[model samples]
Target: ADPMIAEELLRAGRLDDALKALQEQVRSQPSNATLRIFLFQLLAVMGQWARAQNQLKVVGELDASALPMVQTYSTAIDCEALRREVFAGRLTPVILGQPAEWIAPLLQALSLDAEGHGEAAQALREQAFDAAPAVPGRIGEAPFAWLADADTRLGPVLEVIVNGRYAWLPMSNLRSLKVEAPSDLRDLVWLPAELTLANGGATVALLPARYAETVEHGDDAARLGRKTEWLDSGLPVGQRLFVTDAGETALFDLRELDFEPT
Candidate 1:
């Protein structure tokens, strides 16, 4: 069976089908490192910890370029040290500093269903959810430090003011888009956007301003122009562009909008 087919099934939330497909492929192509890796990830996602661990050990024997990726998965699956440290109420700076992609899912899983380790998992999960923002002269104060890590390019970060609270929008996780004319402005359009957190079960909305466009009729011709003050003089009204990052694509929204100030 094609691995891409299995990947698509996994993406569609068909875990059982994906597991069966990959398991069959791995059995037939026992030497295929990629097949084993896919199988291992599927097992891990299914909470088959022992099976996943066994597949990970077999992955170690295959001399493939995927070893590094497999190693990261190993740390997440066989994270006894991480579990103990988190449960001990002694969150070392090192564990707290792991990337959200690397650590958050495992922590979330253990938090809800770590069988014999329920108490520790629940504590870590509660702390992760109730994490406070970092302050000066404070260590481990920020619960979701992964959100602030500039290195993890989860998506576009837009700074906006909403409900009197300043917030950053990860425009990459946009679920839907809407266009509306705010009552306060007739010539401007408000693009209210929604964003979802990468790991945590949370969502936020941000309303950014954009100038409306005007069409002018000339002698047997037509011209388009901006109706309101241009927020970024470099970008024309109604202009659109595409940016691809971390295997995901997002619209630039406004080319002239500066992300630097945020």
Candidate 2:
């Protein structure tokens, strides 16, 4: 089977199947770095920290340039050492530049540690918040409502870390937020708009303008069916959304959506 088929399974949320397929591929071609990288991502997405750590070791041996990023992720998964480093102010901005899915949990963990660097960890968290734009509007009585904006071009859909678990959202779904073009006009420039999430939940929204430079006219039209398919699948409420570009990632935590009414 073509390796790309596994990506389709991955997008469809078949983790166990994707893992099995990748493992089979890896077994045949142990030196395939790309397959190994995808396998590592799958392991991390599955919350198999120990297994992810072991894979990272293999990745490091295969490619030296990936060492720093790999090392930071290894530390991120090790709660005790990560907290110690946070308290000591040893985590550099470089580490912070890794995917929010990998680093956000570390920050969240440090924030909860009694002996951890609360102030320092919070500063880092705020830095991440600053990079990603927030979605407008208040839903219910939640304290905050925001969705971190990232370049949707990274992939048609991407998995983000939300409250210590993996949540997937579609990029094509965001195209719905593009300003409606006049029916008579063949071409027109328009600003991006925010599309509210369905289900009366406060957690999801699309901010198409955040990546305006990458936006193109008629792009939304091309994806209408794909977008509807994703929206029909329902949004993952109360999860943090992340956007990344050039190794830098931002987080948008829908903290309020997780609140339960008394």
Q: Which candidate wins on lDDT?
A: 2
Task: Give the alpha carbon lDDT tens digit for every residue of 214-261 in model 2.
Answer: 112112322111121112212211112343222322222222222112
Clash count for candidate 1 is 0
| Regions more than 4 Å wrong, model 1 | 1-4, 64-66, 80-262
* TM agreement with the true structure for every prediction: 0.34, 0.37
Predictions in order: lDDT: 0.39, 0.40
Residue-level error in angstroms, candidate 1, position 128: 13
- Please list all clashing residue pairs in model 2, or write none if there are none: none
On TM-score, the candidate that comes out on top is 2
